[PDB]
Design a protein around this ligand. Structure first.
Ligand SMILES: CCn1c(-c2cccnc2[C@H](C)OC)c2c3cc(ccc31)-c1cccc(c1)C[C@H](NC(=O)[C@H](C(C)C)N(C)C(C)=O)C(=O)N1CCC[C@H](N1)C(=O)OCC(C)(C)C2
Ligand SMILES: CCn1c(-c2cccnc2[C@H](C)OC)c2c3cc(ccc31)-c1cccc(c1)C[C@H](NC(=O)[C@H](C(C)C)N(C)C(C)=O)C(=O)N1CCC[C@H](N1)C(=O)OCC(C)(C)C2
Ligand SMILES: Nc1nc2c(ncn2[C@@H]2O[C@H](COP(=O)(O)OP(=O)(O)NP(=O)(O)O)[C@@H](O)[C@H]2O)c(=O)[nH]1
Ligand SMILES: Nc1nc2c(ncn2[C@@H]2O[C@H](COP(=O)(O)OP(=O)(O)NP(=O)(O)O)[C@@H](O)[C@H]2O)c(=O)[nH]1
Ligand SMILES: [Cl-]
Ligand SMILES: [Cl-]
Ligand SMILES: [Mg+2]
Ligand SMILES: [Mg+2]
Lengths: 166, 170, 170, 165
């Protein structure tokens, strides 16, 4: 992109490299939410996604991660504070690869996010969409296989490294 | 002989549905929160001298996915309606869960027990009389519990089985 | 809206009850044997355009614990009765399951499907015709399956759902 | 002579849990006691050391002893893959009874179980040949790792085993 930043995750399975996933962050349309995810991916504020886990993976739906504070699917924090408001609902959950904010109700964005593996249109207007997988959707498909119907994963899926690409 | 009962645990997020279920099934408690998607358990017990299998469906507190939640209520035979004694909103939420069960099951008389959980904590906002008054208005039992100390845990589930058996006598 | 179906998988030790269930649910097969005590699964599927929630009880092949086995039959809505095509004793056992289901349900009309599993193996000892004739004599469907090649696996479970639907809508 | 005693040092994901010792009723069930004794010392070149209690069901038993397939399906005796049921003199009377697992008549190998309750419906089907001497509290701890279907919440193994004087 000429305008939107690209960030990457190197995904690991019980510490073994699985592959790289890269994302286009839609700073052009969702700037505050995109900037949070970008900064959490570089770690430039002194905290962020590196080392954290995809704690909930449900085949046919999504891969969810981003709790680097409680490390158990309950926590999260943004670069703006513990939570920030829903910025806009301009973009929709249109299919696999959409990157969107997890939340616990209105205006509770932190750091948790999910990567859709299918269209999830019932989340439109409730979760802020802010990016998409650029490269590595096959790696997301490979992660999906470690999930289960209740989200529990059979091996530990982590963000072994992450950062911003030029 | 034996019988089997499909019990469904409902109530707002964080009230202790899973902690109650895990006490019944696994005889322990941890402070760590593990938010539920859906889990099911089975346990063989004797209640009032009659052996039964309990099928327990531990539901998430979230209110969306009405098609799936309607199915939980169609198949369920009795409902534990859980609130936390230090969460007034969770007590206010109870009437919603109850209206949903009545509409899905096409009945004003569905086996249910009102459970006031977290009674070990010093931060009560819902008093016993408020909950007893609500349970009386529904014609159902009220049981106070603590998943942490195990107080009332067996009683809540066994009372629900007793309510199902009473309903089946009609 | 959806509909839930309570399926129970029965049959002699080692005939492939679990392998069939795991192929239906998880779409894989392994040669390694994990002997069952009891397992239960839930899976949402679309069958003939209708959304179905399959509750599958994967029972052990052992023949003791009649109180528990009877309860499996009381609660179950339809039965997948599995033998292996290279295990003559497992085919000879099938009539015991039909007799027990009819006794517990007190009925001669119970949804069931006869399944001849391991049809990929070149060590057959039970002819297809023998099994077809037995199923015809019970008035129930018969299908050959392979949990290894996936031949007939969806069809066996979906046929059982269709038998339950017919019984309930009659 | 004095019935032999054997010990298991039980571990949880490799960390010591505690010791269980057993009296083996060689005076009443000599062939079956001798198999378990020899498998506990390893003196034939194979046996229980390192193997798992793969199936633990609270209220009933802790079962283990598959040192050949490591998945609950295997095991072998010192007499061959299987040996006959020796006698049914002793019964599954209560917690601590040690008895042979099997797949039907005359199929004793190495798998065994420790009762955590009376299991009288197994009388006449499983050969009882010993009992816990010391460490019932360790067996009670093992039981807490089990579940309805026998799967354990952590891996329970015989980290060491042998014969006491
Ligand atoms: C009825 C069963 N059932 C289903 C469902 C629906 C239809 C068919 N089949 C099923 C399942 C397979 O049947 C077993 C879903 C589902 C979802 C939940 C609970 C039960 C569910 C559920 C539970 C807790 C939180 C959330 C959802 C929202 C969550 N928030 C938090 O995790 C925060 C955190 C960010 C602080 N916490 C922890 C709290 C408490 O809020 C969030 O933002 N997302 C990001 C977006 C996808 C979403 N998770 C999620 O997991 O959807 C799973 C999904 C898509 C399958 C829907
Ligand atoms: C109906 C549910 N159900 C129950 C039951 C009964 C009443 C109430 N609630 C339940 C359970 C809790 O409800 C889920 C039992 C039970 C037992 C089995 C299967 C289902 C069961 C079962 C399954 C396979 C093998 C055996 C039992 C016998 C086994 N043999 C092998 O493992 C060999 C191996 C030595 C080569 N293999 C692998 C093969 C295939 O033969 C053996 O010797 N023992 C040593 C003695 C206790 C016994 N296991 C065992 O586990 O009993 C569990 C028990 C006591 C709870 C009974
Ligand atoms: N002090 C105390 N804490 C409790 C009690 N019951 C549950 N908790 C705590 O409350 C939190 C939420 O409990 P949990 O059982 O997960 O709640 P839930 O109703 O299942 N939540 P969900 O809707 O997400 O599935 C956990 O931290 C748990 O330890 C109780 O009786 N006393
Ligand atoms: N070739 C082949 N092997 C199969 C097939 N189905 C099962 N098996 C094999 O047969 C063995 C027993 O299968 P399993 O599903 O565990 O049998 P079960 O009927 O569930 N046994 P249990 O009564 O102990 O629960 C396993 O080794 C499995 O791989 C099949 O269709 N083809
Ligand atoms: Cl959701
Ligand atoms: Cl048994
Ligand atoms: Mg819960
Ligand atoms: Mg099986």
């Amino acid at each position: 992109s000429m305008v939107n930043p690209t960030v990457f995750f190197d995904i690991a399975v019980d510490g073994e490299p699985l592959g790289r996933v890269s994302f286009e962050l839609f700073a052009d349309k969702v700037p505050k939410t995109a900037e949070n995810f970008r900064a959490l991916s570089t770690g430039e504020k002194g905290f962020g996604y590196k080392g954290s886990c995809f704690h909930r993976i449900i085949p046919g739906f999504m891969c969810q991660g981003g709790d680097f504070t409680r490390h158990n699917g309950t926590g999260g924090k943004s670069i703006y504070g513990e939570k920030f408001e829903d910025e806009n609902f301009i973009l929709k959950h249109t299919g696999p690869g959409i990157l969107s904010m997890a939340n616990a109700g209105p205006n509770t964005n932190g750091s948790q996010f999910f990567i859709c593996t299918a269209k999830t249109e019932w989340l439109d207007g409730k979760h802020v969409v802010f990016g998409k997988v650029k490269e590595g959707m096959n790696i997301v498909e490979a992660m999906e296989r470690f999930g289960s119907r209740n989200g529990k994963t059979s091996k530990k899926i982590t963000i072994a490294d992450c950062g911003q690409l030029e | 002989s034996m019988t089997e009962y499909k019990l469904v645990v409902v109530g707002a997020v964080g009230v202790g549905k899973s902690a109650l279920t895990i006490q019944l099934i696994q005889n322990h408690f941890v402070d760590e929160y593990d938010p539920t998607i859906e889990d099911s358990y089975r346990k063989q017990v004797v209640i009032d001298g009659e052996t039964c299998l309990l099928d327990i469906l531990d539901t998430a507190g979230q209110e969306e996915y009405s098609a799936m939640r309607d199915q939980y209520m169609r198949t369920g035979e009795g409902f534990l309606c859980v609130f936390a004694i230090n969460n007034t909103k969770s007590f206010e939420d109870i009437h919603h869960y109850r209206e949903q069960i009545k509409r899905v099951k096409d009945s004003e008389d569905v086996p249910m027990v009102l459970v006031g959980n977290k009674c070990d904590l010093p931060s009560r906002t819902v008093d016993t009389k408020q909950a007893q008054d609500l349970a009386r208005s529904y014609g159902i039992p009220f049981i106070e519990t603590s998943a942490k100390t195990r107080q009332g845990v067996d009683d809540a589930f066994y009372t629900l089985v007793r309510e199902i058996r009473k309903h089946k006598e009609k």
